[PDB]
Paper text:
Enzymatic degradation of PET using suitable hydrolases, like the leaf branch compost cutinase ([name]) variant [name], offers potential for PET recycling under relatively mild reaction conditions. Computer-aided enzyme engineering performed by Tournier et al. introduced an Ile at [name] position F243 to enhance the enzyme’s catalytic activity by further expanding the substrate-binding site. Additionally, thermostability was increased to 94 °C by disulfide bond formation between D238C and S283C in combination with mutation Y127G. In this study, [name] was utilized for the application of a crystal contact engineering strategy to increase crystallizability and test the rationality of the applied approach.
After successfully implementing a batch crystallization setup for [name] variant [name], ICCGY mutants were generated according to strategies to either increase crystallizability (Q6E and T110E) or, as a control, not to increase crystallizability (negative controls [name], Q183K, and Q238K). Mutant [name] crystallization was microscopically visible after 22 h, similar to the WT’s crystallization onset under the same conditions (26 h). However, [name] crystallized in larger (344.5 µm ± 63.2) and fewer crystals compared to the WT (247.8 µm ± 70.9; 25 crystals), indicating a trend to a reduction in nucleation events. No interaction partner could be identified for the mutants [name], Q183K, and Q238K within the standard range of electrostatic interactions (<4 Å), as intended for the selected negative controls. Furthermore, the crystal contacts of the three mutants remained comparable to the ICCGY WT. Furthermore, mutations [name], Q183K, and Q238K neither resulted in unintended electrostatic interactions nor affected crystal packing, as the crystal contacts remained similar. The three negative control ICCGY mutants were meant to crystallize, but not with increased crystallizability compared to the WT, which could be demonstrated in this study. The negative controls [name], Q183K, and Q238K, which did not aim to enhance interaction at the crystal contacts, showed no increase in crystallizability. The consistent space group among the crystallized variants of this study (ICCGY and mutants [name], T110E, Q183K, and Q238K), all crystallized in batches with identical conditions, emphasizes these assumptions.
Numbering used by the authors: 2 to 258
The structure:
Amino acid sequence: SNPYQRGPNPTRSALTADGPFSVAEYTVSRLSVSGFGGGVIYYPTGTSYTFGGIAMSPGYTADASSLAWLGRRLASHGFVVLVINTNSRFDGPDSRASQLSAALNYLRTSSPSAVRARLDANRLAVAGHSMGGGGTLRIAEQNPSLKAAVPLTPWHTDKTFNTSVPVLIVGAEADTVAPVSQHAIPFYQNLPSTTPKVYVELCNASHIAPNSNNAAISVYTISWMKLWVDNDTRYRQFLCNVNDPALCDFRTNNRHC
Ligand SMILES: [Cl-]
Ligand SMILES: [Cl-]
């Protein structure tokens, strides 16, 4: 049962480190693509399976290297992951959405044959930090064929996204760049009631929490991607009846349970 199932039965502990798949890396140079600023693809190797794909945007003034740890972590749990560089480091959230859109088309159509051989382009998802997270909400609303969206410490001036794509938002309690009361929590609140949605808030963490290995971001991002990109109900346990000391808030409409 479940053609998309990959990897062993999960434990929390296994989800805080790199997973069972070996990972290859391919550098997409800036000038080799129109529509975004290149980036790095992390993708499984040593395997004959196909996997869902994820496009992920860094944050304001940031490089793709800021999220390398998470691109590798995801790919090692069984995902083809393209972390973009933006055309300009100063690009805003809606610009980042359009570049996510270009990056997804690139992954499907024009990436190297070794990458395409590992990708099931029918199952794609998006994630992003800061302003990249605002771009994630924008594209989830523009393109409801996506399987999931994970905005990390997100920032946007627009507060309402009418999307049927399942969304998990990571807020940081002590974020002063995108305070959760103005950004993350309103985005959560304003998503449709019928859309499966989760908000998790990291205790004593600031806007830079996504820039380095973080156990909570690892568990919740892996689990949400697994549950919706792979229909993998083994990951429901990490997302249901949550009692996590690392979190200082938790909200959900509990549609995913
Ligand atoms: Cl913009
Ligand atoms: Cl092959």
